[PDB]
Design a protein around this ligand. Sequence first.
Ligand SMILES: Nc1ncnc2c1ncn2[C@@H]1O[C@H](CSCC[C@H](N)C(=O)O)[C@@H](O)[C@H]1O
Ligand SMILES: Clc1ccc2c(c1Cl)CNCCC2
Length: 261
Amino acid sequence: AVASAYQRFEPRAYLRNNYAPPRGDLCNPNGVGPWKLRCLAQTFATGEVSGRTLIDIGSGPTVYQLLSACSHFEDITMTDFLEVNRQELGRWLQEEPGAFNWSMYSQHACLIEGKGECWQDKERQLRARVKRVLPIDVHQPQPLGAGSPAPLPADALVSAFCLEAVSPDLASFQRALDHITTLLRPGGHLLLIGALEESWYLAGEARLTVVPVSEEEVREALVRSGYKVRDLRTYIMPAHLQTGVDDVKGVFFAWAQKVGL
Ligand SMILES: Nc1ncnc2c1ncn2[C@@H]1O[C@H](CSCC[C@H](N)C(=O)O)[C@@H](O)[C@H]1O
Ligand SMILES: Clc1ccc2c(c1Cl)CNCCC2
């Protein structure tokens, strides 16, 4: 019942604790930012993750997870439990007042994708291909929605730092993976990112309990959920990026594919 803890969840403080210097300074290439962006880039660049519809589970108030993704899917669905986040996403989608500045990220995305595109173009392609920001709950068998405006089955899935942060144990985690997995077509791809062996992280007045997980657990889970792991990489949190906003030890990136058998 973590749900009660997220109610105090402050998006502005969250973003600040994870997407501002030092973690949000994409200048140094040995950072979390460059790494996550690079994993995403390299994956889609293989051109094996392609389709029409794509869904991002547990978007929170961030967009970086779709900068490279938007290029390959015309219909995109952002999601998240807290409306405060859904609202925060909007301010950025609609270029509204005081939205969060994702420039540094957009630029580094264009830098890495090396397609020569400028960030405004990419940011515009994202805002364009993002259709709706739908409320979601990974704990429901039919993940938030009985008859959602979201095209199902989505041709692809993307989740960053969600599962481990809304599940109290490795069990709910599996159940949570199973759940969202139902939205993914039988050959669809899943790009999952998460915290490795972390157990808590601040976000303003709120204090979230998370499930410390390992690469092998994450793997076994993807498998035990019906996926065929294609790539599973792990970033180890450097010292300078270990502030007091959480206790993450490292970060994982998984390119999973729903077995078509
Ligand atoms: N039951 C639930 N189902 C889905 N998302 C949930 C949830 N409970 C909380 N969340 C959302 O899970 C997110 C974890 S934070 C990760 C945010 C974003 N992906 C970025 O990469 O950082 C929060 O935005 C929180 O609101
Ligand atoms: Cl870089 C980066 C980005 C997002 C998140 C973390 C890290 Cl380490 C881990 N701390 C908890 C919030 C999720």
